[PDB]
């Protein structure tokens, strides 16, 4: 078939990809996608997922909260994705991704929504 096209100047930021707000439904599984330009960073960045207040996600390696981080050899980009299972209205709201390096420091903010049943 046929398709369109696009074009723009590379982003002047370390966060090659920002976690766009994802609207999920209660009882469903949420998933966020984000990337980080390591090259631009002096040292290995620190990926940490926070929830509204000064909370702390990913307590143990065996909870609904899953984390997928992959590092490319040629690309050199860290692709992190936050997956949440059995989402509830108590989870919906806003989040914040902290990322600090040797000297470089940057953080992005996303918002999730949990649609309730009829």
Curated annotation (Swiss-Prot):
All residue ranges annotated as the Ig-like C2-type domain in the record: 11-114
Domain of life: Eukaryota
Function description: Thick filament-associated protein located in the crossbridge region of vertebrate striated muscle a bands. In vitro it binds MHC, F-actin and native thin filaments, and modifies the activity of actin-activated myosin ATPase. It may modulate muscle contraction or may play a more structural role.
UniProt family annotation: Belongs to the immunoglobulin superfamily. MyBP family.
Protein name per the record: Myosin-binding protein C, fast-type
Organism: Homo sapiens
Residues of the full protein shown: 47 to 157 of 1141
């Amino acid at each position: 078939g046929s398709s369109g096209s696009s074009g723009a100047e590379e982003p002047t930021g370390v966060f090659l990809k920002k976690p766009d707000s994802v609207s999920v439904e209660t009882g469903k599984d949420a998933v966020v996608v984000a990337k980080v330009n390591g090259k631009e960073l002096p040292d290995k960045p620190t990926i940490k997922w926070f929830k509204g207040k000064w909370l702390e996600l990913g307590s143990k390696s065996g909870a609904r909260f899953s984390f997928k981080e992959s590092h490319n050899s040629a690309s050199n980009v860290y692709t992190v994705e936050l997956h949440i299972g059995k989402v509830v209205l108590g989870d919906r709201g806003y989040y914040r991704l902290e990322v600090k390096a040797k000297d470089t420091c940057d953080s992005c903010g996303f918002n999730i929504d949990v649609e309730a049943p009829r």
